Design a protein around this nucleic acid. Structure first.
Length: 121
DNA sequence: GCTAATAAACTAAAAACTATTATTATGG
């Protein structure tokens, strides 16, 4: 977290999208962090959420939304609890920018992808 | 020169169905 904060402390100074190496590193680390994102501390968790929001805002020159790690996250097991809501937060981060609501990069079903949410209702 | 009892509607709570209430743990 400290090093990524330092990295994003400047974005106009440097922004990695030239080599595909930096792009895939950014996407892979994005996946890493959004797999790691959870806290019972309710603020450092939101801190990570805002970190991701800032990251995607200052980027997408090298970023790619999985729509799968998120999908399994916000879907949960169709529970009664509030767990999968964390993935829902990702959606806001996803809706933090002009991102496609669900790009079917392969397409899970492109239809029940939102049926999961209307079930979460 | 006869109280052997039973057919007792009463004032019975000894469910609360579903509707606001409130401490908690709070949050930044």
């Amino acid at each position: 977290v400290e090093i990524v904060a330092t990295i994003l402390s400047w974005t106009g100074l440097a922004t990695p999208t030239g080599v595909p190496k930096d792009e895939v590193l950014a996407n892979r680390l994005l996946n890493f962090l959004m797999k790691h994102v959870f806290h019972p501390k309710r603020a450092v968790f939101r801190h990570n959420l805002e970190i991701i929001k800032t990251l995607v805002e200052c980027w997408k020159d090298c970023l790619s939304i999985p729509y799968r790690l998120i999908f399994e996250k916000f879907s949960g097991k169709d529970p009664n609890s509030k767990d999968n809501s964390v993935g829902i937060q990702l959606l806001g981060i996803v809706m933090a920018n002009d991102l496609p609501p669900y790009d079917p990069q392969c397409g899970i079903q492109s239809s029940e992808y939102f049926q999961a949410l209307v079930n979460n209702m």
